[PDB]
Structure formats: C-alpha cells, structure tokens
Amino acid sequence: CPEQDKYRTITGMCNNRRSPTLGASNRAFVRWLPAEYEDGFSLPYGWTPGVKRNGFPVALARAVSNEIVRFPTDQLTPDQERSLMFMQWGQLLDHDLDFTPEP
Amino acid sequence: VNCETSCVQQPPCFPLKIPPNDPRIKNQADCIPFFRSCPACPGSNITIRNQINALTSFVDASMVYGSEEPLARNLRNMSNQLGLLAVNQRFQDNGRALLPFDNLHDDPCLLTNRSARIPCFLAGDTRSSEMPELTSMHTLLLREHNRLATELKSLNPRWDGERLYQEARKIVGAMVQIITYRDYLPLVLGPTAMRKYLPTYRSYNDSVDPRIANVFTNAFRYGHTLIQPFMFRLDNRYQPMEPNPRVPLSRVFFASWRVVLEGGIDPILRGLMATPAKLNRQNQIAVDEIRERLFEQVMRIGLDLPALNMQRSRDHGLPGYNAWRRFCGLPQPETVGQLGTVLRNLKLARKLMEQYGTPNNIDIWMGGVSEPLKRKGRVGPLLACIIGTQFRKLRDGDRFWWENEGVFSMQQRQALAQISLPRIICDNTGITTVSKNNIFMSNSYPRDFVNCSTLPALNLASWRE
Ligand code: HEC
Ligand SMILES: Nc1cc(Cc2ccccc2)c2[nH]nnc2n1
Ligand SMILES: [Ca+2]
Ligand SMILES: [Cl-]
Ligand SMILES: [Cl-]
Known about the structure:
Chain B: The record marks 127 as: Transition state stabilizer. Chain B: Ca(2+) binds at residues 56, 58, 60, 62. By secondary structure, chain A is α+β, with helices and mostly antiparallel strands. In chain A, 22% of the residues lie in helices and 8% in strands. Chain A has one domain (1-103). Chain A has helices at residues 61-69, 84-97; strands at 27-28, 78-83. Chain B is globular and about 65 Å long. Strand 1 of chain A pairs antiparallel with strand 3 of chain B.
C-alpha cells in the first residue's frame, strides 16, 4: 500500500488501508446471511427434482414468472412521479457497483 | 455442456425448466438457458459457494474508467498529454464523441444488423451496448471527462496527461456520487428510509466494509420493474422522432447501430427525460419485452428477466424472503393471511403461497418487488433496507467519498454541490431544454422542462494551481 495517494486505483485496491482488497475488483462478494444450498455448500435449490426447501417443493422460476409477473402490456401504468431517466440511472449506477461473471 | 444450446443440467449449466401450459414455450423438453456464476473457490468440497464481483464496489465511475488496469489503460487517449478518454475514430454524433468499438470474438451487436456492421462499444463496464439508453449515459459521461480535461488544461497548461485524467476522473466520480445520493436514492427509498439508512454524512470510517453483498446483486434488480416496453426518441421540440419513435425493447438490445446511425444520443436522452418510467404495481410487475423477448434477436430463445433473477438468487444460495425480513428487523409472515397483511393484498398473497408453499421460500427479488411501495419511494420496506444498508456502506466506507476531508478542498466541494444531471446533458449534447430538478421526478414536457441558460454550470476556478 502506498503511504500517500491523491487518487483511487482503477481496481479499488488500497482504498481500505487495513484490508486493501475490500471494495476492490475481482473478489468474492460479502455475505450478510449464510448461503442456502441444497447440499449446503454448492447446489442450488431446484437443481434436484423432488428436493424440497423448508418442507415445500421448489417452484420453477419460469412458472413464478408466468403466475406472478406476467401482465398484458396494455395495462402498463406510467409513473406520474418518475422519468425513464430514473430507470436508466439505476442501471448505469448498478454497472458502477456489480458485475457477476459467468463462464 | 454448452449452456447456450443444451438443456442438460450439467455444471456450469442450471437451465430454467419449462412448466405446463407455458404461454410461449410449448415444448417442456426445451429450456431458458442459464450459466451459473463463476465460483469464488472453484470445485471446493470445503468452503461455501460464493460468487465474484468483477467491479470496484465504490461509486467511483468505474463504468466509465474500468475496474482492471489493462482496460483502463486502453480506454485512454495515449496519443497526447491531454488526459482524454479514447473516442470512436470511425464515427461522431453531430461533431460530438461516441464510445470507441470493442473487438469481440462473437459480437452480439453485429448480430442485430448485418448491413450496418456496428459492433459493441468499449467502456469501463462490458454491458454498455446492452441498450441504446444505457449507451447514451455511457457516452454522456465519456464526453464530461473530456470536457473537464479540456477546461483543466486551459486552466493549468503546465499539467500533463496523468494529472488531467486523474483530476477529471475524480470529478466524474464525484458527480456520479452526488446525483446518486442527493437525487437518485431519496426517490428510490423515500424520505423515511433515507433518514434511517442514510443519515447525514459524518466522516470516512475505515471499519465500514464497502464490499457489495451477494443479496444486493439481486435486490438492486428492482429496477427491472421500471422498464418500459419501448425505447422512445424525441426531436428538439420533445415530439416523437419518426420513423420508429417508439421502438420495442426486444429490437434495441445490443443495437449499437441505432446510436451511430439512427440519430445519436440526443433523441434517446430527451426520451429518458420526457417519458414516464413504468410504475411497479402488484398485478403489473414486469413487461413482456423482458419477461418473454429478452435478447430475442441474438439468442436461440427469448429470455425471461424476472425468472432469470429468481434462478440467479437460487444459484447464489440466497436465503428466502422471511430470512431477509428478519435480517431487516421486519415481521416475517408465516400464514397466507399474514403475507396478505404485509402485501396489503390477499390475492397476491394466495398466488405467492400457491407457488412457494411458505413465505420462507419466496425468492428475494420476487418478495421484494411484491411489497407495497414506501411513500415517495419506489421500493417496499425489505428492498429499502437492503438498498439503504448497501449505499451507506459504499458511502461511510469510501476513503475517496467526495465529502471526505482531503479529497476536495472546501472550495472544490462548494463548486461540486452545484452539479446536476440536466447540466451535464446541456454541456455535452445539442439539447437546449432539460428537466427541472429533480431530473428523476420531471417526466412531462413542457411542464417540467427549462432552458440550459437558467442552470448554473460547474466552476473549476478552485482547481487552478
Ligand atoms: C435499477 C437497477 C437496474 C436496471 C434499471 C436494470 N437492471 Fe438489470 N441488473 C441489475 C443488477 C444488480 C443486476 C445483477 C448484475 C450483476 O451482478 O452481474 C442486473 C442483472 C441483469 C441481468 C443478468 C440476468 C441473470 O441473472 O443472469 C440481465 C440480463 C439484466 N440485468 C438486464 C437488464 C436490462 C436488459 C436492462 C434494461 C434494458 C436492465 N437490466 C435494467 C440492475 C438493474
Ligand atoms: N450480470 C448482468 C448481465 C447482463 C447481460 C449482459 C452481459 C455481458 C455484456 C452485455 C449484457 C446485464 N445487462 N444489464 N445488467 C446486466 N447484468
Ligand atoms: Ca465502482
Ligand atoms: Cl448476502
Ligand atoms: Cl474505434
């Protein structure tokens, strides 16, 4: 860690001088709650058919989407209090904070 | 094995299986593809599976500059000592800059139009070309750094490339933080959640963990419920810009050609400013442009964003709704009636119960986007907690937070306090009529719009050496 800096590193390394990787890129997320996996350590709920979560079967994400989320486009309510810039800032902001890589 | 083509559930595949009577996919032998997020510890039978953040958690405008050193280096104009960001050399938008192109192996932007031959743009974050509206904001910011590195060069001509770039980067990073905390967040959270989670800034605290929490990557997807089924373009009069003024979303994803050829960033920004966002309602959660036709053009099948969010939370081992409410110090509904009360809606409670069996199993995004909205906010109590808690951490735990002593002088901060997103638009586009503050509330023309003349510009006098 450099003793005296005027600007951030690109990586975010050295922002926290005690734990220098904190907030830095290409590191594990922090967990606020212990992970809940089928096997306890790696397998996601719904990975194995018949395997229940808290004594109840695992709903298909596509089914929850169909039953809960699905609505007809015509019904859309425009927010009288928000611009599409409000939505757009959210995405651009999200893109400053997290990107979860996949293979 | 190959996740983009197969329905075989074999590591790293976790395909979204199709239910009976699906309104779009009749073959239950088909699937919505899904690659599990890279494990922090590959193949461990010991340590609990966690995912990685390719980005700096700080509100440091890494979406403009990069989170990895070679990318940051490449995004810069290394031809001179002006400390500028590299701009597209093949194209311009009315004599104004566009982002430079990226050299991708399998490029999804080229797939949106063979004739046009417009590839993905290069920016700090790799999702910049995802939609032309996001591309407009990335371009807006690429222009603000270059405009500031020009004003600072004319103010301090003895300054070199590294200085000018680092000094401009620092201002952009602070603008991002100001807009977010002064304008954006209060309108997401509402006034009460804003006081609770974001009390007045005291100072930098090196014991505050600034990392993004796994849950936040899902909770922050609440914005998918604000998405409109079209991309709107408006001329200088804020009237539809024909042809194709309302282009459906499933035709704009990776359509970088629409920016380069269909009018640049200005018709897109006016559209963002003068169009209302979609309002999240219990029976109107998220649009089919994302729930049915997400990346439709470029994939073998349309993806379902709400469903992808629920599969992602399961892949990330995120506890259910009640565990997060408990974490927030909020009552956890056990029965259908109790969920009804929390939701102020027994019909939705009955449906959620049919799907999950218990409010303990409701996926984070699902249960979060289902809660009634806090007064003057766009989230319910659970998301307000997760969102608020995360933002306070990124603020209280940022050594380079704009208000931190030694970051900017008292003079530089009084100058920075004057910034706004409507002004950044004025300074870097041909747009002359912008939103009245707050830019996030202002959605009606000509009622909520004013001229650039009225708006105060940023004064860089306190940056003179
Ligand atoms: C208010 C915030 C917000 C907005 C607006 C938003 N997203 Fe998201 N989105 C997120 C977050 C957080 C993630 C998780 C990113 C990560 O960590 O990799 C994400 C993830 C995604 C993912 C990854 C899906 C998966 O789980 O595999 C897709 C696809 C996506 N968003 C598409 C979009 C599209 C398309 C738009 C606009 C057209 C958009 N998002 C608008 C916050 C938002
Ligand atoms: N993890 C994600 C993924 C995508 C899709 C994508 C991935 C690579 C490049 C462009 C687009 C997102 N789009 N918006 N937020 C996102 N968060
Ligand atoms: Ca960042
Ligand atoms: Cl977490
Ligand atoms: Cl180029």
